[PDB]
Design a protein around this ligand. Structure first.
Ligand code: 444
Lengths: 11, 245
């Protein structure tokens, strides 16, 4: 439930 | 499986480098800008801003600070080894805590001001937010940290431990986090021993201090959000909502 957090972790 | 002295020395270097690459503002820049202080006119400008606009500005700036903490986490030795769930649990719980610690760099104890939007200003700049007690708590916490005179390397090693805290509820691989935490503790203690600064240990903030400040922040956010729910929807960063909503 954390798409922007995962996106940052993935960048 | 525990770490050699060489691995611990490497870990000190690694953590300091990660901080160096993600500290957002350079300490030398912050210090040299102490004489640049918001004029009475500019302070009046801020105080006249609406509550919602001040809240949205502060949410923006906090979110930017939080992105740098995430980058710090990503470059930290052994963070990538954590499962995805635990990465989120640690950051959701700890990111704001790290920001509150990092804030002392931008705080001038001589005149009780903080670097904000390009100049130094006192707590009165923040009147429009309508949460004087929270503001006061934040300035008090920065003042307590100013007295320790952290080095940048100390800030690096201490914020690593603020993030890698095995006692967060919800962690699924507690033991792995305990091991990473222990090694980071060894690195922090090693560095302090070499620099003759072990005396700071007794002076560090009491355990649930950071937790208290973060819980107050969330409460004030919830009160705001309750009073202005469309503003939060329309104008707060998504990351901020995910972290705090
Ligand atoms: O915690 S705050 O109340 C806050 C409110 C709303 C959104 C984010 C943060 N606020 C406290 C303060 F008293 F300082 F205002 C806050 C303001 C500014 C910051 C910032 O530290 C800084 F530097 F801008 F002042 C930053 F965000 F950047 F970190 C952090 C928290």
């Amino acid at each position: 439930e954390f798409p922007y957090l995962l996106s940052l972790l993935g960048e | 499986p525990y770490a050699s002295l060489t691995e611990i020395e490497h870990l000190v270097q690694s953590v300091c480098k990660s901080y160096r690459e993600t500290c957002q503002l350079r300490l030398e820049d912050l210090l040299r800008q102490r004489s640049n202080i918001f004029s009475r006119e500019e302070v009046t400008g801020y105080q006249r801003k609406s509550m919602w606009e001040m809240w949205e500005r502060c949410a923006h700036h906090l979110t930017e600070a939080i992105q740098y903490v995430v980058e710090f986490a990503k470059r930290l030795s052994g963070f990538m080894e954590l499962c995805q769930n635990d990465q989120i649990v640690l950051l959701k719980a700890g990111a704001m805590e790290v920001v509150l610690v990092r804030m002392c760099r931008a705080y001038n104890a001589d005149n009780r001001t903080v670097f904000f939007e390009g100049k130094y200003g006192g707590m009165e700049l923040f009147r429009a937010l309508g949460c004087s007690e929270l503001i006061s708590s934040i300035f008090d916490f920065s003042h307590s940290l100013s007295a320790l005179h952290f080095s940048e390397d100390e800030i690096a090693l201490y914020t690593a431990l603020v993030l890698i805290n095995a006692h967060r509820p919800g962690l699924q691989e507690k033991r792995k986090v305990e091991q990473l935490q222990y090694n980071l503790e060894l690195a922090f203690h090693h560095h302090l021993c070499k620099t003759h600064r072990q005396s700071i240990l007794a002076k560090l903030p009491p355990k649930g201090k950071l937790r208290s400040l973060c819980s107050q922040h969330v409460e004030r956010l919830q009160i705001f959000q309750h009073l202005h729910p469309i503003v939060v929807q329309a104008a707060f960063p998504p990351l901020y909502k995910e972290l705090f909503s």
